[PDB]
Every structure is written in structure tokens, then in C-alpha cells.
Amino acid sequence: AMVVSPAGADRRIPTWASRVVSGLARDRPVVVTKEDLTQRLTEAGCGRDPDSAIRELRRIGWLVQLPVKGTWAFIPPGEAAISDPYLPLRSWLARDQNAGFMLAGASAAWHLGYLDRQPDGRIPIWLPPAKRLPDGLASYVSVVRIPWNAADTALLAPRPALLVRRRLDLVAWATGLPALGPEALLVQIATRPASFGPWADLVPHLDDLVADCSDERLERLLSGRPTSAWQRASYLLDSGGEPARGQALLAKRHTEVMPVTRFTTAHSGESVWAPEYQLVDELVVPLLRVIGK
Numbered sequence: 001a002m003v004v005s006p007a008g009a010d011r012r013i014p015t016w017a018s019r020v021v022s023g024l025a026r027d028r029p030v031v032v033t034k035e036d037l038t039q040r041l042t043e044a045g046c047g048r049d050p051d052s053a054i055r056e057l058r059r060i061g062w063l064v065q066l067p068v069k070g071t072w073a074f075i076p077p078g079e080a081a082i083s084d085p086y087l088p089l090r091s092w093l094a095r096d097q098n099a100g101f102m103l104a105g106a107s108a109a110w111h112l113g114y115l116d117r118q119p120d121g122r123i124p125i126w127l128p129p130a131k132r133l134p135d136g137l138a139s140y141v142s143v144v145r146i147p148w149n150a151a152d153t154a155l156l157a158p159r160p161a162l163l164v165r166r167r168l169d170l171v172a173w174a175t176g177l178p179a180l181g182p183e184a185l186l187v188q189i190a191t192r193p194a195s196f197g198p199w200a201d202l203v204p205h206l207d208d209l210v211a212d213c214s215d216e217r218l219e220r221l222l223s224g225r226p227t228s229a230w231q232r233a234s235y236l237l238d239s240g241g242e243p244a245r246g247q248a249l250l251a252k253r254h255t256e257v258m259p260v261t262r263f264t265t266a267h268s269g270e271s272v273w274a275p276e277y278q279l280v281d282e283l284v285v286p287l288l289r290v291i292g293k
């Protein structure tokens, strides 16, 4: 959630650093790169080694190292911390504007409005097959790796018209980062239910999610997924109160024969049988049952 100055709110400013800190205080960059700090030192008439300058600024609490190499957060005067849970990802974009990730799973669901509680923990993202996660980020992010076409991000992102209808800001609804829309979210959690954490937080709001999904987008995002994903996605439509849509979606799958599938994050509670989708539900209805009690 927060990046905290180890020095507390009241930080000394050595004279050598006065213009550097004042410039960062005026400009308030989201992330400070090593190159940005190097240039600001030079501009200040400061001939300090950049690494040395940063080490001291770190020690005294003005810069806090971020997970991606060569990035820092500036903690502004008068503040003890920054409240921004996505600074690890912004630090990645600071080094690589083509990072190519999208907020996924619980983060996407949270900003789309399907969760009771703000999720915490590692930030769930989707990355295309071809993109590697920088090593510094593994402790901060969990990656879901469904081989969607990275070229068609219009498919992955929510429909702008949906954002407008939902009173979400066209650009800042997920705090300015790229994020999966409801269709890609639903397909993600149907394809790999274990990739999604707060199921109990989501399941009361399936009606809300399902009402926001276009079935054509669902179908194109399911194209190439295993049949089980289609079964589970169609059952989610049913569970969100749209059995006719669920059965129609399931009828558009590529493979005719439909093995029985489990809807579970880890098979071992109670279960419901949905023959329409050849699905044993160990998750959605069983959670709804615990929640009602």
C-alpha cells in the first residue's frame, strides 16, 4: 500500500541537496529514475557522484528504492509516506514504456467495482507470453499468463462505452494503469480459478460482473482456451443470473465433446452439479453458502 520514508516526516535537507530536493518538490515526478536524478544534480551545480548522492538521499529519507533497477520514489516535503499501491508497476513503466502488463484478477475486479474490500498482497497482472517480468518485481506482483494476442489490447481493456455507463474515468479508473475489462477478468478467472484470490469477495457480485460483459467479447477471449474455461465461463453467466446467455456461450465452443470439469481453486466443503455445463461447482455456490450462514 505505502512507501514510507525511513526518516519520518521531518527530514533534514543538507545544503548540497537543497536545489535537488526543491526541484523534485516542485515537479513531483511519479518515479525518479537514476538519469533524472543525475541531471538534477548537474543542474543544481552539484558535482557529487550520482550513486553517492542517491545513497545519502536514501539514508536521510528523501528517496526510497523501488523494485526496478534505477528507480526511486521521492517522498515529498511534509509527508511521511506515499499511498500508491502500484508504485512497483509505475517503476517498471519508468524504465520500459512498453512493459506491456495489465492489472488483472483482484486489482481489475476492485476498480471495476466487483469487490467488497480493497485487495492487498502482490499485485495481480497479466503479461503476454513474450514478456519477461523484471526479477526485482517477483516479490511485488503475481503474473497470470493466458496466451491472449498482445496486439489486441482493445479486446482486453474494458469497452470505453462501458466505462462511461459505469461512471468510470476513461483513463484513470484503474489509477492510470492498463487493466483488464470485465470480459477479460471473467475469462481469466474461469480459465484459471486459482489465479484469483478473493473469490468470497467476488461471488456476491457476479450479477454485476455478468451484466457488464458483452458475449461477443467473451467468445473472442475464450477462443483457444481449453473447453473447461468455456464451461466455467458459461456457468459464471448462469450464476450471475443469465442462464440463457451461459448456454448460448457454451454452444459456441470449438470442441464438441465436453468432459466433466470442476470449478475449484484446489479440489478436495460441498459441491453442486450443473449438467448444462458438465460442471461440478466446488467454489461459487459453496462460497455463497458459507457467506449466507
Ligand code: NA
Residues within 6 Å of the ligand: 207, 208, 209, 210, 211, 212
Ligand atoms: Na455491472
